[PDB]
Design a protein around this ligand. Sequence first.
Ligand SMILES: [Au+]
Ligand SMILES: [Au+]
Ligand SMILES: [Au+]
Lengths: 125, 125, 125, 125, 125
Amino acid sequence: MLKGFKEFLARGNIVDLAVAVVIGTAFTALVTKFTDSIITPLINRIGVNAQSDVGILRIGIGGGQTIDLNVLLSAAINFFLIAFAVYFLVVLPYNTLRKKGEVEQPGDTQVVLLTEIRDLLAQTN
Amino acid sequence: MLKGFKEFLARGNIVDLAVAVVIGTAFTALVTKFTDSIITPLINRIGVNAQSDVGILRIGIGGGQTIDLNVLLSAAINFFLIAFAVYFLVVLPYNTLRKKGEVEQPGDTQVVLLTEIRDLLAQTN
Amino acid sequence: MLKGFKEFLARGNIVDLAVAVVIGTAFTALVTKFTDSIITPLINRIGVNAQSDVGILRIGIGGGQTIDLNVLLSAAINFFLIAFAVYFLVVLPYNTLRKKGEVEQPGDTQVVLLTEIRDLLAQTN
Amino acid sequence: MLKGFKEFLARGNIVDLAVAVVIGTAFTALVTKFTDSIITPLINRIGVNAQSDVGILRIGIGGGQTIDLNVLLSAAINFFLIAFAVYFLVVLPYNTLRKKGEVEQPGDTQVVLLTEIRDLLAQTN
Amino acid sequence: MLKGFKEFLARGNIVDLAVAVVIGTAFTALVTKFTDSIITPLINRIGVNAQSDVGILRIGIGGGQTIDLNVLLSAAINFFLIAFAVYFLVVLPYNTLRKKGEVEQPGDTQVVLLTEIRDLLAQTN
Ligand SMILES: [Au+]
Ligand SMILES: [Au+]
Ligand SMILES: [Au+]
């Protein structure tokens, strides 16, 4: 069992990925929770949004219906906050490190080797 | 420790992925929120949908039961909006950049290299 | 800024992935919404499921408790429908196109080149 | 337009992926649903868990507060069930197939090719 | 049918990934549940947070509104626990195994081979 989980993990391109979804989900969850506790309430004190129209579904009930705009705006703001947080926390550093050329990846090293291979092959002739 | 987390992050084919799931979930969520606040209500002012039949679960309760179509239809519209949104915002540009050729990738460059190698090895004959 | 987001996207193996999660989550959501509105109610008019046993948690409350089977079954049905939908819509077409041989890919072209190289190298020797 | 969606789909390394997320979310949801309907109720009849302490938030309300264990354990059990399910349904078969050598992959065929090349390049010397 | 799903599965880069999303979502779900059951309550007996301001939406209702801070801190702590959990359970072992090199992967063997090839091509000169 320790062998199946561990042998699958050496195999575990899956491990790199599982972690990625783990962080990705954990983090999106954090930004939206901040938005709900801090932002949505702010949107709400004001709320001259949520308009409406009469709603007596002759199939379900009968009383009144609304169009909540504050929620949409609350969500839009949440979205922007995510883009700023990700781009700023993540993007400035990863893009800066790839430009200064200090980050890595399997495809890139293969390329260097393939390239070196090309050069030597060229030298033989 | 700072070493383990950072070393794992340059490693972060995972980083590319985590970000991808982060945006994918964040965005799908934004579209569904719009569908729910703006669209579901419009579907609802009408609502000649939600039909039903008697429901007295001789196992749970006893009172009445409903089949909501407005929700099914509201959900479907949400989906189309996502398909159009992803395809139009994401698809027209990425597919157009690949056809014109501007977007890049590790596999493609390896190909270029392998190809040149093939051409050279052929030249040696 | 427009340059940074766009340059990271050209970079975006991530874009391929983010899009994938977006569609995958959006679609699963659609299937379950159909199951809940059309199917669960049907399970429920019948609902001779949800059994139970007394439940007075001497730690939290005291009143009664139930085992909802209708939900378990509704979910299962939801699942089978997903399997029929993905396999029938996605699988019949991708397995049939790979069998007839018409789907291109970076890994496959590389193999072709690697193979040509092997053959040529064998010719020199 | 039909050309853009279809050309992106032949392209769909993404399709492979979307299907993966689609299936992954669908299945996990199925297990947790079984956990909730079947398992949680059982945890709950017993429930000598959920302990507590008075809770009158002088900032929000005022009355009493609880620490639920049955849920923590219910989730824990849900989790073990997922691991056994994924590992047993998924892991025994893919690890056995990779070991017996039947599940193929572009990366692996390339390896064989690279390996063969190494061997040949070596015979020349 | 058994052939199409199975043929698609050997094909299944998708299988590696789907399993990855399954484990990532399942695990994040577990961390947050622990936080909610064990942690949020602890945060709450205390709760001198959830501040507020009057809230009578001249568009929706009219009565009062709150900015729940406890939830924000509760979510943050949840996040740390995930970071600690993934890195400590996942990171120490994978980072250590790669350093000891005990861990294997198709990309890495490709590199070794590319290197040897580079080295041999270099010897011919
Ligand atoms: Au009734
Ligand atoms: Au009872
Ligand atoms: Au109390």
